[PDB]
Design a protein around this ligand. Structure first.
Ligand SMILES: C=C(O[C@H]1[C@H](O)[C@@H](CO)O[C@H](OP(=O)(O)OP(=O)(O)OC[C@H]2O[C@@H](n3ccc(=O)[nH]c3=O)[C@H](O)[C@@H]2O)[C@@H]1NC(C)=O)C(=O)O
Length: 416
């Protein structure tokens, strides 16, 4: 659909906002249900497009489920191991179905992801792991055909840190009745949340440094779990508060999943005060430039890069923002320039020369997470900002415009 936002800037964000469950924790956790025949219950699952597409895939695979009150009730009656190309083209993370399906049937046919606006994003590490696991892997008809003669212990080291690569490996190993080892894994909170679920199902998982020791099982149980809060949504609203010089209280967020974000926010001039579990955020000092480099967790999230770039576009001084994760992820920089920003891009590094003010205009969303930066900029840009193709934002945030409206943003959605 061609829905879009109309943001009339000039209002400070003030008030409470309830942070939703983590989209990227819910996804792998839902795919984990494929590992058992027993019923599972997953709560605090956000109602956003990626979750809905995942549920559609599970139903296509044979599962019986319901999604009500941010809770997924599923009977994992999987009777197929084919993840079609259409679903993969709609959400490349559907590749997470590979590990579970292989662990359940010893076979899987999953469409190979195509390019993405964020980058080529190949999955060589995923395929490399499964080959190291002893599976026969062949690409035909744009599908990855994986066949496993027999499950055996695995000792694999990732050539680079990959979030879903780590998750796909863990999902499979959880089904192998032997002791396996993964080295150089991702430590993102979502990966840790998936790990708790796999343990609840019966697998043993020990994390030391970036190594994961796994002892799987062929009789995994059903589980009940409440997914962690979404740290990217939380960070986004924090930026919103500082940028608009408002004062917000985030409810249901986790400060322990936001260290790098809070650190940079304070360097820029914002402040974050913890009240019990709540986080009160506001601007303490005038905005100032700061250098930022994205890194795998616990470092600064690439998923928060665009949002901070919007904040820095109106800060005093020149900021350097380098991407070490998705080096191509800068489409938003030029959209911000359309609002009067002064951002330059040279390779994997962007330089932001702060300007006194932004001027509202039409900008296009293209990144389910990074495009939130456009909404943020629209909150302070002079006049009105039109954010096109919010379909992307609907994939990455639950009721974004509604939460902003509740905080005083003069935003509205035009269904088209
Ligand atoms: C973009 C999203 O969030 C993303 C988030 O930005 C990134 C980085 O933190 O980690 C997840 O993707 P991801 O697992 O594909 O990211 P990674 O695998 O760690 O890729 C990091 C870098 O490694 C490279 N990479 C990764 C795997 C691989 O086999 N080969 C490879 O070259 C990628 O090209 C990328 O430049 C999140 N997605 C989910 C479903 O967990 C989203 O919500 O869709």
């Amino acid at each position: 659909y061609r829905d879009y936002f109309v943001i009339r800037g000039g209002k400070p964000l003030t008030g409470k906002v309830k942070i939703s469950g983590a989209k990227n924790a819910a996804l792998p956790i839902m795919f984990a249900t494929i590992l058992t025949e027993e019923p599972c219950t997953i709560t605090n699952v956000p109602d956003l497009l990626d979750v809905r597409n995942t549920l559609l895939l599970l139903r296509e695979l044979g599962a019986e489920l319901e999604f009500l009150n941010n809770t997924v009730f599923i009977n994992p009656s999987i009777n197929s191991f084919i993840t079609n190309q259409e679903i993969i083209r709609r959400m490349r993370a559907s590749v997470l179905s590979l590990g579970p399906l292989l662990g359940r049937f010893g076979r899987a046919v999953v469409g190979l992801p195509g390019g993405c606006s964020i980058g080529a994003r190949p999955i060589d590490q995923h395929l490399k792991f499964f080959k190291e696991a002893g599976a026969d892997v062949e690409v035909r008809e744009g599908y990855v055909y994986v066949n496993l003669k027999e499950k055996r212990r695995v000792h694999f080291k990732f050539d680079l840190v990959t979030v879903t690569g780590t998750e796909n490996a863990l999902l499979y190993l959880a089904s192998v009745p032997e002791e396996s080892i993964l080295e150089n894994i991702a430590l993102e909170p979502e990966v840790m949340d998936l790990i708790e679920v796999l343990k609840k199902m019966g697998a043993h998982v020990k994390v030391e440094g970036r190594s994961a020791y796994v002892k799987g099982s062929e009789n995994l149980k059903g589980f009940t779990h409440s997914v962690i809060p979404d740290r990217i949504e939380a960070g986004t609203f924090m930026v919103g508060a500082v940028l608009t010089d408002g004062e917000i209280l985030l409810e249901n967020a986790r400060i322990n999943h936001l260290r790098a974000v809070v650190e940079k926010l304070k360097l820029i001039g914002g402040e974050v005060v913890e009240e019990n579990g709540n986080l009160r955020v506001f601007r303490k000092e005038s905005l100032r430039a700061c250098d930022i480099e994205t890194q795998v967790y616990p470092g600064f999230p690439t998923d928060m890069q665009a949002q901070f770039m919007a904040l820095l576009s109106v800060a005093k001084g020149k900021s350097r923002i380098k991407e070490n994760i998705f080096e191509h992820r800068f489409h938003h920089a030029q959209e911000l320039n359309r609002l009067g920003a002064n951002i330059t891009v040279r390779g994997n590094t962007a330089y932001v020369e702060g300007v006194e003010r932004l001027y509202g205009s039409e900008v296009y969303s293209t990144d389910l997470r990074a495009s939130a930066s456009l909404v943020l900029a629209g909150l302070v840009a002079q006049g009105e900002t039109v954010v096109r193709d919010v379909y992307h934002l609907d994939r990455g945030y639950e009721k974004l415009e509604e939460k902003l409206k509740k905080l005083g943003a003069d935003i509205e959605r035009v269904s088209e």
